[PDB]
């Protein structure tokens, strides 16, 4: 995260850390949507152009964490993946559309003060919350700057405003799609901030003023640098892909 | 044995020749085809006998006979249109006109080394030079064309002329974008810095680095060609205060292999000078050092399997001309698409702004097609 | 109030109570910058 601040303890209990076995390193962010299901970005574990394809066995998920490196026993909870299900429509070639993956946990993770699942928006909720002008919350252990400590000591957080499609689109030569939205501050607003290397897969969340609950409206996908003036972070439009998520959940359960 | 271990022997010989030339001219640009040299020695060995053949055999470490097949297969694969990238190679041996050449010599040469052997009246210098310079121009698609002058091939005192020419310029698996090709500072040998055009690209390349027997460190990167069989290797001293001459002598095919088992992929800003290297080499003196002195002796040279009669035949001129161009042209943007995006954060650099040596390597065979040092692009 | 949704047998336990945080919501406590998110819906910018 860029231009963010330290997350409070139990501020983002659904936050998940995608950790690689060997070597031992941070891979991406991710979110906990239930007892055994974790959500993340596709490209975090499938990118041919770099020869990257991990497997349930290459990977580990760390839940309830706060520190980026310290081992938090009795707090965090590491779990393994029974299976990986990434979206077949995942356009890894040109624009990274459908940047999304599920990952099932071999054993159901127990909930506590540091581990709780986030809600997924329904038609009405997605319609009510996902609008240009509203702000969302981004979180991750990604780098503090695009170019330049560099890595955060503890989970980072930042709030960003959802941007107008026409604007997002006239911001990059890349071919946007209805499956992705972009957020971030315009150059003439003062406040800045963005996701960055390592933040991918992380959740973009919003809180319902109606029922006091938190919803994941996006997945950190891609951007042209970090905290660039005139640039914006692009996030996977979750709901617009909820059908697939339901199919997999019930089918490959 | 293994056609790989054999190619190893050939390439080694060429490299040893490279080391020789390099030490005698440290600050100059030198491009050689190690494998090409092995082919020339083969061409020669085919029609040589007695002491002459004995010398060639003990240097090459292998005898043309009983191996030709292995040598023909490798020499065929290298040029094979299956590489997608085309390596033009010309091989010719010219013999005095007033001498009847043998049939099996001509036949075998064209068969194993794709070499054209034929007569030419050296009695007339200008006529021979044009005749030869014209064959190279044709055999290399106008790529190379100026091996001999008129003041070189002179009189009937010139009996035998060997020639090997190699040209190359494949297509990068990851083309450079001209928009990103700007002039960057290059520090030459003398110490002076020059402003020189340089290719620049952000992508994943195999990298690495180790120390020489003298504990001096150098880096090396692999730049594969869209063909997927021929790749370019670049190595240069890690410390700016380290002379290239301090790493060269410690490099054999054996070390080139280590490179292959050591290098790992990593996202990098690879910046290397855009240049076109072309050098002509006289292999006479270097080859003498290796122990091959007979064939250069008007009387001692024994080439019986070359001539129908017992005429005295010796090597008057043995030459190689290698040409390579490094440019932007290559395959395009499919992995280049999003690959441009995931560069979320400036990556490390592989900047070649100091005298460096390069390799063109045919992976399947292990054949080292090119070996060069660039002191000033 | 939440619904439905998803089958708890194949989805796992959680959804029902999803969105609520033990150390904040389940304790009538607000995190430092969450008001910003709320105030966002009606700030006119
Ligand atoms: Ca607003
Ligand atoms: Na920005």
XYZ file of C-alpha atoms and ligand atoms in Angstrom:
677
model
C 0.000 0.000 0.000
C 1.088 3.574 -0.723
C 0.335 6.527 1.558
C -1.666 4.368 3.969
C -1.479 3.687 7.699
C -1.186 0.817 10.176
C -4.292 -1.335 10.511
C -5.723 -1.750 14.002
C -5.846 -5.210 15.563
C -8.832 -7.072 14.118
C -9.561 -4.273 11.655
C -9.591 -6.653 8.693
C -10.175 -10.191 10.074
C -10.984 -11.496 6.586
C -7.569 -10.461 5.288
C -5.503 -13.431 4.120
C -1.810 -13.763 3.282
C -0.829 -15.864 0.269
C 2.474 -17.415 1.347
C 4.810 -19.629 -0.696
C 6.391 -22.753 0.793
C 9.831 -22.710 -0.842
C 11.254 -20.317 -0.698
C 9.289 -18.753 2.162
C 7.966 -15.421 0.899
C 4.879 -13.229 0.589
C 3.064 -13.793 -2.705
C -0.187 -11.827 -2.593
C -3.207 -10.744 -0.595
C -6.528 -12.553 -0.343
C -9.865 -12.596 1.458
C -11.793 -15.059 3.610
C -15.391 -15.425 2.437
C -16.297 -18.385 4.649
C -15.177 -21.353 6.727
C -13.223 -23.065 3.960
C -13.195 -20.649 1.024
C -10.621 -17.979 0.188
C -10.760 -15.434 -2.629
C -7.832 -13.917 -4.515
C -6.613 -12.649 -7.883
C -5.966 -15.076 -10.731
C -2.612 -13.676 -11.857
C -1.309 -14.229 -8.329
C -1.051 -17.925 -9.188
C -1.296 -18.167 -12.981
C 0.818 -16.159 -15.413
C 2.205 -18.128 -18.391
C 4.251 -15.206 -19.800
C 6.420 -15.683 -16.709
C 5.928 -19.439 -16.479
C 4.011 -19.096 -13.214
C 1.573 -21.827 -12.222
C 1.379 -22.809 -8.561
C -0.619 -25.720 -7.162
C -2.456 -26.520 -3.936
C 0.917 -27.946 -2.914
C 3.175 -24.999 -3.781
C 1.123 -22.647 -1.626
C 0.004 -21.793 1.905
C -2.548 -19.323 3.259
C -1.977 -17.408 6.489
C -5.069 -16.153 8.303
C -5.591 -13.700 11.163
C -2.160 -12.164 10.654
C -1.152 -8.586 11.430
C 2.643 -8.503 11.307
C 4.207 -8.983 7.880
C 6.974 -11.338 9.013
C 6.585 -12.260 12.689
C 5.059 -15.612 13.674
C 1.849 -14.935 15.593
C 0.866 -18.235 17.216
C -2.491 -18.301 19.000
C -3.396 -15.452 16.654
C -2.799 -16.371 13.020
C -3.739 -19.731 11.508
C -1.936 -21.318 8.564
C -3.897 -23.647 6.289
C -3.319 -25.647 3.102
C -5.257 -25.705 -0.166
C -7.364 -28.748 -1.035
C -7.878 -27.408 -4.552
C -7.425 -24.349 -6.761
C -10.203 -23.089 -9.026
C -9.301 -20.140 -11.247
C -11.717 -18.617 -13.752
C -11.509 -20.120 -17.276
C -12.424 -16.761 -18.814
C -9.358 -15.347 -17.060
C -7.811 -13.256 -19.837
C -4.170 -13.386 -18.739
C -3.096 -12.273 -22.209
C -4.043 -8.640 -22.830
C -5.956 -6.896 -20.024
C -6.209 -9.326 -17.094
C -10.009 -9.500 -17.169
C -11.625 -11.878 -14.669
C -8.553 -11.698 -12.441
C -10.032 -14.014 -9.818
C -9.441 -17.383 -8.167
C -10.837 -19.501 -5.407
C -8.858 -21.809 -3.187
C -10.417 -24.302 -0.930
C -9.009 -25.084 2.465
C -8.210 -28.703 3.329
C -9.545 -28.048 6.832
C -12.176 -25.486 7.912
C -10.510 -22.534 9.646
C -11.921 -21.702 13.081
C -13.143 -18.130 13.561
C -12.017 -15.878 16.410
C -11.308 -12.217 17.128
C -8.784 -12.136 14.280
C -10.469 -14.470 11.805
C -13.888 -13.605 10.393
C -15.340 -13.913 6.869
C -16.417 -10.920 4.786
C -19.802 -10.639 3.079
C -20.299 -10.765 -0.686
C -22.682 -8.223 -2.246
C -26.060 -9.132 -3.723
C -27.570 -7.417 -6.772
C -29.083 -4.620 -4.670
C -26.033 -4.124 -2.441
C -23.665 -4.041 -5.409
C -26.048 -1.561 -7.026
C -26.248 0.582 -3.891
C -22.559 0.726 -2.983
C -20.529 0.457 -6.194
C -20.710 4.031 -7.490
C -18.214 6.722 -8.454
C -17.804 9.153 -5.558
C -18.016 6.592 -2.767
C -14.910 5.364 -0.955
C -13.642 1.844 -0.304
C -10.939 0.311 1.868
C -7.810 -1.369 0.515
C -5.444 -3.444 2.651
C -2.252 -5.455 2.196
C 1.394 -6.078 3.033
C 2.552 -4.707 -0.329
C 5.375 -2.208 -0.808
C 5.211 1.361 0.515
C 6.275 2.880 -2.807
C 6.515 2.004 -6.496
C 10.125 3.117 -6.847
C 12.541 3.450 -3.929
C 12.170 0.608 4.414
C 10.119 -0.302 1.338
C 8.093 -3.055 2.983
C 5.591 -2.407 5.797
C 6.070 -3.736 9.326
C 2.379 -4.527 9.785
C -0.828 -4.776 7.757
C -1.500 -1.507 5.929
C -4.803 0.169 5.087
C -6.013 3.002 2.869
C -9.376 4.418 1.809
C -9.929 5.267 -1.857
C -12.779 6.812 -3.892
C -14.379 4.847 -6.735
C -13.803 6.574 -10.078
C -16.033 7.164 -13.109
C -15.751 4.540 -15.850
C -15.201 7.167 -18.568
C -12.368 8.559 -16.437
C -10.712 5.266 -15.511
C -10.876 4.331 -19.191
C -9.317 7.511 -20.585
C -6.506 6.874 -18.108
C -4.862 3.851 -19.721
C -4.237 2.482 -23.208
C -5.213 -0.904 -21.779
C -8.648 -2.184 -22.795
C -10.847 -1.898 -19.703
C -13.962 -4.051 -19.332
C -17.256 -4.126 -17.425
C -15.626 -6.780 -15.236
C -13.242 -4.269 -13.658
C -13.502 -0.875 -11.971
C -10.798 1.564 -10.888
C -10.425 3.710 -7.772
C -8.055 6.446 -6.596
C -7.684 10.203 -6.199
C -7.591 12.666 -9.075
C -4.315 14.632 -9.227
C -6.076 17.853 -8.197
C -7.589 16.572 -4.940
C -4.584 16.583 -2.604
C -5.038 13.234 -0.891
C -3.390 10.348 -2.748
C -2.711 6.623 -2.316
C -2.839 3.297 -4.140
C -2.134 -0.426 -3.942
C 1.261 -1.768 -5.010
C 3.564 -4.749 -5.580
C 2.407 -7.462 -3.177
C -1.052 -6.021 -2.561
C -2.628 -7.903 -5.476
C -5.336 -10.406 -4.547
C -6.170 -8.164 -1.604
C -9.790 -7.176 -0.948
C -11.420 -3.855 -1.790
C -14.125 -3.549 0.862
C -17.044 -1.241 1.667
C -19.289 -0.916 4.722
C -23.077 -0.894 4.433
C -24.645 2.094 6.209
C -27.831 0.017 6.209
C -26.773 -3.115 8.095
C -23.372 -2.183 9.509
C -21.725 -5.053 7.610
C -18.612 -5.014 5.414
C -18.723 -6.111 1.776
C -15.952 -7.004 -0.656
C -16.640 -5.071 -3.848
C -13.292 -5.615 -5.551
C -10.024 -7.521 -5.735
C -6.719 -5.712 -6.174
C -5.721 -6.567 -9.740
C -3.357 -4.234 -11.575
C -2.113 -0.689 -12.138
C 0.500 1.253 -14.089
C 3.039 1.838 -11.329
C 2.014 2.864 -7.819
C 0.315 6.084 -6.726
C 0.872 7.571 -10.187
C -0.599 10.994 -10.930
C -3.309 10.512 -13.556
C -3.349 6.770 -12.920
C -5.751 4.530 -11.014
C -5.786 1.091 -9.419
C -8.044 -1.386 -11.185
C -10.098 -3.886 -9.197
C -11.930 -7.080 -10.126
C -15.680 -6.467 -10.185
C -16.588 -9.236 -7.739
C -20.386 -9.392 -7.989
C -20.291 -9.381 -11.793
C -18.635 -12.762 -11.274
C -20.707 -14.092 -8.383
C -22.398 -16.711 -10.572
C -19.107 -18.479 -11.278
C -18.273 -18.231 -7.579
C -21.595 -19.886 -6.739
C -21.093 -22.558 -9.393
C -17.676 -23.513 -8.035
C -18.714 -23.285 -4.382
C -21.576 -25.743 -4.885
C -19.892 -27.865 -7.562
C -16.315 -28.322 -6.333
C -17.298 -28.116 -2.658
C 30.787 -40.393 -28.413
C 27.994 -37.911 -27.691
C 27.595 -35.403 -30.549
C 27.579 -32.900 -27.686
C 30.986 -33.919 -26.339
C 32.288 -33.758 -29.908
C 30.921 -30.270 -30.527
C 32.525 -29.420 -27.191
C 35.935 -30.325 -28.609
C 35.392 -28.180 -31.699
C 34.013 -25.158 -29.858
C 36.883 -25.391 -27.380
C 39.461 -25.129 -30.153
C 37.723 -22.025 -31.496
C 37.650 -20.449 -28.044
C 41.358 -21.101 -27.493
C 41.972 -19.301 -30.774
C 39.761 -16.480 -29.516
C 41.818 -16.148 -26.340
C 44.970 -15.858 -28.444
C 43.712 -13.081 -30.713
C 42.193 -11.211 -27.768
C 45.408 -10.991 -25.734
C 47.255 -9.588 -28.754
C 44.593 -6.922 -29.312
C 42.901 -6.135 -25.959
C 41.154 -2.869 -26.852
C 39.852 -3.882 -30.284
C 36.506 -5.366 -31.269
C 36.896 -9.076 -31.985
C 34.195 -11.334 -33.408
C 34.918 -14.991 -34.106
C 32.983 -18.171 -34.815
C 34.538 -20.856 -32.593
C 32.494 -23.574 -34.301
C 33.348 -22.122 -37.705
C 37.009 -22.746 -36.925
C 36.306 -26.398 -36.148
C 34.692 -26.659 -39.583
C 37.695 -25.085 -41.310
C 40.093 -27.478 -39.583
C 37.791 -30.284 -40.726
C 37.672 -29.030 -44.304
C 41.477 -29.023 -44.235
C 41.876 -32.392 -42.518
C 39.780 -34.079 -45.203
C 42.434 -33.640 -47.905
C 45.519 -33.640 -45.696
C 47.906 -36.510 -44.997
C 51.147 -37.339 -43.178
C 52.555 -34.892 -40.641
C 49.950 -32.342 -41.710
C 47.002 -34.595 -40.851
C 48.797 -35.721 -37.692
C 48.947 -32.136 -36.428
C 45.300 -31.384 -37.208
C 44.175 -34.649 -35.612
C 45.980 -33.994 -32.324
C 44.530 -30.486 -32.008
C 40.961 -31.264 -33.061
C 41.062 -34.332 -30.810
C 38.950 -36.125 -33.425
C 39.424 -37.516 -36.937
C 37.117 -36.437 -39.752
C 36.683 -40.097 -40.700
C 34.150 -42.170 -38.756
C 32.739 -38.916 -37.401
C 31.717 -36.967 -40.509
C 28.147 -38.171 -40.019
C 28.061 -36.639 -36.538
C 29.694 -33.489 -37.910
C 27.260 -33.288 -40.827
C 24.208 -33.653 -38.580
C 25.338 -30.856 -36.261
C 26.389 -28.607 -39.141
C 22.968 -29.304 -40.652
C 20.969 -28.605 -37.491
C 22.700 -25.266 -36.917
C 21.496 -23.900 -40.256
C 18.266 -25.926 -40.223
C 15.298 -23.700 -41.061
C 13.778 -25.222 -37.920
C 15.536 -22.527 -35.896
C 13.223 -19.906 -37.393
C 16.333 -17.759 -36.986
C 18.657 -18.113 -39.979
C 22.419 -18.529 -39.583
C 24.144 -17.919 -42.921
C 27.393 -19.887 -43.197
C 29.788 -19.958 -46.152
C 32.618 -22.474 -46.558
C 35.058 -22.557 -49.469
C 38.522 -23.846 -50.317
C 40.166 -22.388 -53.419
C 42.921 -24.256 -55.253
C 45.442 -23.166 -57.882
C 43.976 -23.452 -61.377
C 46.769 -25.531 -62.926
C 45.986 -28.360 -60.499
C 43.441 -31.154 -60.927
C 41.327 -31.439 -57.770
C 40.160 -34.830 -56.467
C 36.509 -35.906 -56.675
C 36.008 -37.468 -53.221
C 37.527 -34.367 -51.625
C 35.078 -32.038 -53.364
C 32.181 -34.435 -52.782
C 32.824 -34.985 -49.065
C 33.488 -31.305 -48.325
C 30.171 -30.176 -49.800
C 28.509 -33.048 -47.941
C 29.851 -32.579 -44.412
C 30.791 -28.892 -44.325
C 28.546 -27.593 -47.104
C 31.838 -26.353 -48.537
C 32.441 -25.401 -52.164
C 35.903 -26.400 -53.371
C 37.027 -25.233 -56.811
C 39.896 -23.923 -58.936
C 40.720 -20.291 -59.688
C 43.558 -18.660 -61.630
C 45.643 -16.908 -58.976
C 48.010 -15.995 -61.807
C 45.698 -13.004 -62.219
C 45.237 -11.435 -58.752
C 42.361 -9.092 -59.645
C 40.429 -11.867 -61.404
C 40.682 -14.228 -58.428
C 39.771 -11.654 -55.776
C 36.635 -10.664 -57.682
C 35.765 -14.316 -58.304
C 36.120 -15.118 -54.599
C 34.680 -11.912 -53.140
C 31.717 -12.588 -55.431
C 31.133 -16.104 -54.106
C 30.978 -14.795 -50.539
C 28.604 -12.002 -51.547
C 26.328 -14.624 -53.095
C 26.659 -17.291 -50.400
C 25.885 -14.754 -47.660
C 22.980 -12.886 -49.260
C 25.088 -9.752 -49.765
C 25.788 -9.890 -46.020
C 29.565 -10.295 -46.288
C 31.745 -9.328 -49.268
C 35.408 -8.317 -48.926
C 37.807 -11.032 -47.783
C 40.777 -10.559 -50.112
C 42.385 -7.588 -51.827
C 44.642 -7.598 -54.907
C 47.810 -7.017 -52.884
C 47.119 -10.162 -50.853
C 46.541 -13.052 -53.263
C 49.546 -12.619 -55.546
C 51.372 -14.635 -58.205
C 51.515 -18.414 -58.450
C 53.136 -18.417 -55.011
C 49.549 -18.632 -53.771
C 48.296 -22.216 -53.861
C 45.567 -22.799 -51.275
C 42.960 -20.405 -49.855
C 40.541 -21.345 -47.061
C 37.506 -19.239 -46.157
C 34.792 -19.347 -43.494
C 32.100 -16.671 -43.240
C 29.256 -16.426 -40.728
C 26.405 -13.926 -40.478
C 23.529 -13.702 -38.000
C 20.652 -11.520 -36.788
C 17.685 -13.575 -35.577
C 14.506 -12.289 -33.949
C 14.280 -11.572 -30.222
C 11.732 -13.645 -28.329
C 11.064 -10.303 -26.655
C 11.573 -7.530 -29.206
C 12.853 -4.159 -28.039
C 10.757 -1.065 -28.715
C 12.577 1.617 -30.732
C 10.806 4.290 -28.685
C 12.838 2.980 -25.745
C 16.148 3.045 -27.622
C 18.041 6.147 -26.473
C 21.720 7.095 -26.167
C 23.426 6.112 -22.907
C 26.959 6.528 -21.556
C 29.414 3.738 -22.342
C 32.846 3.588 -20.716
C 35.465 2.324 -23.165
C 38.725 0.513 -22.427
C 40.975 3.581 -22.579
C 38.683 4.992 -19.890
C 36.933 7.608 -22.009
C 33.130 7.647 -21.971
C 31.094 7.754 -25.181
C 27.431 8.495 -25.888
C 26.058 5.412 -27.633
C 22.600 4.176 -28.684
C 21.311 1.364 -26.463
C 18.410 -1.074 -26.601
C 16.310 -1.137 -23.436
C 13.548 -3.491 -22.323
C 11.656 -4.494 -19.189
C 11.040 -8.231 -18.904
C 12.045 -11.530 -17.310
C 15.506 -12.803 -18.235
C 17.743 -15.544 -16.861
C 20.587 -14.001 -14.870
C 23.403 -14.978 -12.524
C 27.042 -14.414 -11.659
C 30.095 -16.112 -10.183
C 33.783 -15.440 -9.589
C 36.746 -16.379 -11.768
C 39.644 -18.573 -10.607
C 41.207 -15.269 -9.537
C 38.209 -14.469 -7.320
C 37.046 -11.660 -9.609
C 33.293 -11.493 -10.153
C 31.280 -11.073 -13.340
C 27.602 -11.040 -14.308
C 25.867 -12.833 -17.173
C 22.425 -12.649 -18.779
C 20.686 -14.861 -21.341
C 18.740 -13.330 -24.227
C 16.835 -16.089 -26.064
C 15.764 -15.797 -29.703
C 12.168 -16.206 -30.872
C 13.337 -19.458 -32.471
C 13.875 -20.988 -29.038
C 17.108 -22.776 -29.968
C 19.670 -20.000 -30.383
C 20.278 -17.541 -27.548
C 22.680 -14.682 -26.860
C 24.909 -14.694 -23.792
C 26.446 -11.554 -22.303
C 29.032 -11.451 -19.525
C 30.981 -8.521 -18.078
C 32.998 -7.677 -14.942
C 30.918 -6.783 -11.885
C 33.436 -4.249 -10.581
C 34.007 -1.320 -12.941
C 37.657 -1.494 -11.890
C 37.855 -4.988 -13.385
C 39.275 -5.374 -16.914
C 37.490 -7.745 -19.293
C 40.908 -9.293 -19.916
C 40.654 -10.527 -16.323
C 37.737 -12.879 -17.008
C 38.148 -13.909 -20.644
C 40.985 -16.449 -20.237
C 38.924 -18.346 -17.655
C 36.017 -19.162 -19.981
C 35.487 -22.516 -21.699
C 32.374 -24.409 -22.785
C 32.604 -26.044 -19.360
C 32.090 -22.637 -17.731
C 29.401 -21.694 -20.245
C 27.500 -24.725 -18.961
C 27.830 -23.693 -15.319
C 26.211 -20.454 -16.470
C 23.222 -22.488 -17.677
C 22.808 -24.335 -14.371
C 23.355 -21.207 -12.272
C 21.187 -18.607 -14.005
C 17.710 -17.999 -12.610
C 14.812 -15.938 -13.994
C 14.338 -12.388 -12.704
C 12.414 -9.267 -13.715
C 15.010 -6.835 -15.053
C 15.701 -3.616 -16.946
C 18.121 -5.058 -19.497
C 20.020 -2.282 -21.267
C 22.627 -3.217 -23.876
C 24.228 -1.242 -26.730
C 22.675 -1.490 -30.193
C 25.489 -2.352 -32.591
C 26.637 -4.249 -35.674
C 29.892 -6.175 -35.244
C 32.016 -7.312 -38.188
C 35.584 -8.623 -38.029
C 37.960 -10.501 -40.320
C 40.491 -12.910 -38.824
C 43.749 -14.419 -40.062
C 43.877 -17.844 -38.404
C 47.441 -18.592 -39.515
C 49.430 -17.363 -36.508
C 47.008 -18.595 -33.836
C 46.799 -22.050 -35.426
C 50.594 -22.292 -35.521
C 50.664 -21.743 -31.764
C 48.307 -24.688 -31.292
C 50.896 -26.817 -33.098
C 49.692 -26.736 -36.699
C 52.682 -25.399 -38.633
C 53.141 -27.804 -41.555
C 50.263 -26.791 -43.822
C 51.608 -23.231 -43.890
C 54.959 -24.462 -45.203
C 55.338 -24.347 -48.995
C 57.361 -27.569 -48.895
C 56.444 -29.383 -45.675
C 52.679 -29.136 -46.211
C 51.202 -32.499 -47.218
C 47.877 -32.376 -49.063
C 47.865 -35.557 -51.150
C 44.164 -36.375 -50.802
C 43.436 -32.980 -52.366
C 45.285 -33.242 -55.679
C 45.254 -35.975 -58.330
C 49.012 -35.610 -58.792
C 51.861 -35.081 -56.341
C 51.930 -31.313 -56.852
C 53.029 -29.289 -53.823
C 49.965 -27.797 -52.149
C 50.027 -25.578 -49.053
C 47.757 -23.086 -47.279
C 48.601 -19.580 -48.489
C 45.626 -17.837 -46.883
C 43.200 -19.090 -44.235
C 40.532 -16.556 -43.291
C 37.304 -16.117 -41.350
C 34.824 -13.254 -41.504
C 32.040 -13.030 -38.936
C 29.214 -10.498 -38.919
C 26.495 -9.984 -36.319
C 23.922 -7.242 -35.817
C 22.037 -6.547 -32.599
C 18.828 -4.558 -33.017
C 15.260 -4.123 -31.755
C 13.536 -6.444 -34.237
C 11.891 -9.506 -32.672
C 8.602 -11.168 -31.735
C 5.890 -8.944 -30.263
C 3.307 -8.259 -27.558
C 1.262 -11.175 -26.241
C 3.165 -11.848 -23.045
C 4.216 -8.227 -23.529
C 0.598 -7.228 -22.915
C -0.005 -7.500 -19.169
C 3.663 -8.339 -18.612
C 4.114 -4.584 -18.959
C 1.694 -4.056 -16.069
C 2.812 -6.526 -13.398
C 6.027 -4.496 -13.211
C 4.403 -2.951 -10.135
C 7.578 -1.275 -8.877
C 10.874 -0.440 -10.584
C 12.992 -3.560 -11.203
C 16.767 -4.100 -11.023
C 19.000 -3.252 -13.984
C 21.291 -5.251 -16.232
C 23.192 -2.360 -17.796
C 25.958 -3.215 -20.259
C 27.827 0.100 -20.344
C 31.359 -1.296 -20.077
C 33.509 -3.475 -22.354
C 31.780 -6.857 -22.529
C 31.962 -10.183 -24.346
C 29.019 -11.983 -25.953
C 28.072 -15.456 -27.178
C 25.626 -16.784 -29.741
C 24.783 -20.314 -28.658
C 22.928 -23.101 -30.440
C 21.474 -24.847 -27.391
C 20.597 -28.321 -28.745
C 24.123 -28.912 -30.058
C 26.036 -26.673 -27.658
C 27.722 -25.188 -30.711
C 29.210 -21.762 -30.013
C 28.469 -19.912 -33.252
C 29.854 -16.567 -32.086
C 32.335 -15.327 -29.507
C 33.190 -11.637 -29.321
C 34.434 -8.757 -27.201
C 33.060 -5.236 -27.612
C 35.486 -2.553 -26.434
C 33.726 0.293 -28.242
C 30.281 -0.014 -29.894
C -29.847 -8.442 8.811
C -28.450 -10.556 5.967
C -29.514 -13.132 3.361
C -29.548 -15.595 2.007
C -27.398 -17.108 0.858
C -25.214 -19.907 -0.480
C -25.507 -23.413 0.952
C -23.780 -23.784 4.361
C -23.207 -27.476 3.631
C -21.059 -26.720 0.583
C -19.995 -23.173 1.453
C -19.010 -23.698 5.086
C -20.098 -21.847 8.218
C -19.714 -18.058 8.297
C -21.868 -16.140 5.819
C -24.772 -15.694 8.248
C -22.632 -13.531 10.538
C -20.304 -12.254 7.810
C -19.338 -8.580 7.667
C -19.374 -8.080 11.433
C -16.047 -7.656 13.225
C -15.612 -8.994 16.789
C -13.298 -6.202 17.962
C -15.445 -3.393 16.539
C -19.008 -4.020 15.345
C -19.642 -6.830 17.837
C -18.470 -4.317 20.456
C -20.044 -1.081 19.213
C -16.577 0.278 18.426
C -15.400 2.119 15.313
C -11.983 1.801 13.703
C -10.003 5.005 13.179
C -10.926 5.871 9.584
C -14.210 4.049 8.919
C -16.300 7.200 9.354
C -14.545 8.474 6.229
C -16.086 5.609 4.268
C -19.550 6.415 5.615
C -19.274 10.183 5.244
C -18.226 9.391 1.672
C -21.727 8.331 0.622
C -23.109 11.783 1.413
C -20.202 14.241 1.215
C -21.195 15.683 -2.167
C -17.751 15.042 -3.630
Ca -18.697 11.086 -2.246
Na -2.896 7.393 -8.354
